[PDB]
């Protein structure tokens, strides 16, 4: 199916306690593969997945340069945004950036992303056409003008459509045995009496990949609405993911309930009964 590549950088100012801390992480789909922490001693983009280790000194140099270069511009962007907003140098501010590209089933370009957030809210973003910018506010509009006069756009568009999808194609091939595997969920149900007239039913989905999954409870084939409790899909810590839905059930009624799990890695969607 479709795939993605993403970079997530975050700078935080530590006023009176040194220079800002820059952290950047890289993902193909739901699989991190690189990192750069400015408070690290390597001072280099480091690998975080096996299939990226096979990249040569040339690659690591290039990527190290671009992230280190970014960290520096960011640290000066935190300064500029203090001026733009007339903010106090006593307060700590955050500057996030996400960048990446979506591709289709055979590796064609679908969408490109380059956008920013100041203190957790939208700052400036590249519209879908990769031709224009959207500015969240008056400050971001100053930088919208600067990137317009600088013609940043036509550079980002060429990179996203080419280099970015070319790179994703490559990673998907080098990380083939992993980035394209589809692990189905290990499913099962539990039972917890809460107070003699009520018992929680809990449906489980474990060790699957990718993270996209649907858990559906039912009472006589009738979807429940939030009498059920979903938990946010969580990372197992080993490349796979987990999730569970629960319902509170009137004692003796347990068997009226069914669980319904849909996942890419399944042939047919499973249904479970206590």
């Amino acid at each position: 199916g479709s795939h993605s590549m993403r970079y997530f950088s975050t700078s935080v100012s530590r006023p009176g306690r040194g220079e800002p801390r820059f952290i950047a992480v890289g993902y193909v789909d739901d699989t991190q593969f690189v990192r750069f922490d400015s408070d690290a001693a390597s001072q280099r983009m480091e690998p975080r997945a096996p299939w990226i280790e096979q990249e040569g000194p040339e690659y690591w140099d290039e990527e190290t340069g671009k992230v280190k270069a970014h960290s520096q511009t960011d640290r000066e962007n935190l300064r500029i945004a203090l001026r733009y907003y007339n903010q106090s140098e006593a307060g700590s501010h955050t500057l996030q950036m996400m960048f990446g590209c979506d591709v289709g089933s055979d590796g064609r370009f679908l969408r490109g992303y380059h956008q920013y957030a100041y203190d957790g809210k939208d700052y400036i973003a590249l519209k879908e056409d990769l031709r224009s910018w959207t500015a969240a506010d008056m400050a971001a509009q100053i930088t919208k003008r600067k990137w317009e006069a600088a013609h940043v756009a036509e550079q980002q568009r060429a990179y996203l459509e080419g280099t970015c999808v070319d790179g994703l194609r490559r990673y998907l091939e080098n990380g083939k045995e992993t980035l394209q595997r589809t692990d189905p969920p290990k499913t099962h149900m539990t039972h917890h009496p809460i107070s003699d007239h009520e018992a929680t039913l809990r449906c489980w989905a474990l060790g699957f990949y990718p993270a996209e999954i649907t858990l559906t409870w039912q009472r006589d084939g009738e979807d429940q609405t939030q009498d059920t409790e979903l938990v946010e899909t969580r990372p197992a810590g080993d490349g796979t993911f987990q999730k569970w839905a629960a319902v509170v059930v009137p004692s003796g009624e347990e068997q009226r309930y069914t669980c319904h799990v849909q996942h890419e890695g399944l042939p047919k969607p499973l249904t479970l009964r206590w």
Binding site: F8, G120, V231, E232, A236, G237
Partner: protein, 100 residues
């Protein structure tokens, strides 16, 4: 500036089996800003071999982190996750419900 309070999940990597070595996880997510204090507890005690994932964030700019350490569950050994953040008036301790 505008702050989100973290959601917390403590759990194990694999289905816990006493005597069988595993991994305990604490997943903090959907918070902002990124400065956060997370501890894995083995009977009220700070564990010293605890690692975490590289700072990352979600579509809404909110941060998430996985804290983890290897461990072997037992019938008596209790485990918790303690989390502190600007949005919290006091540390929040989430107990590992071995079978939640």
């Amino acid at each position: 500036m505008i702050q989100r309070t973290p959601k917390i999940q403590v759990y194990s990597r694999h289905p816990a089996e006493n005597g069988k070595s595993n991994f305990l996880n604490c997943y903090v997510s959907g918070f902002h800003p990124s400065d956060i204090e997370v501890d894995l507890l083995k009977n009220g005690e700070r564990i010293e071999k605890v690692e975490h994932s590289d700072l990352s964030f979600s579509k809404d700019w909110s941060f998430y982190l996985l804290y983890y350490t290897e461990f072997t569950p037992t019938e008596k050994d209790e485990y918790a996750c303690r989390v502190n953040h600007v949005t919290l008036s006091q540390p929040k301790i989430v107990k590992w419900d071995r079978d939640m």
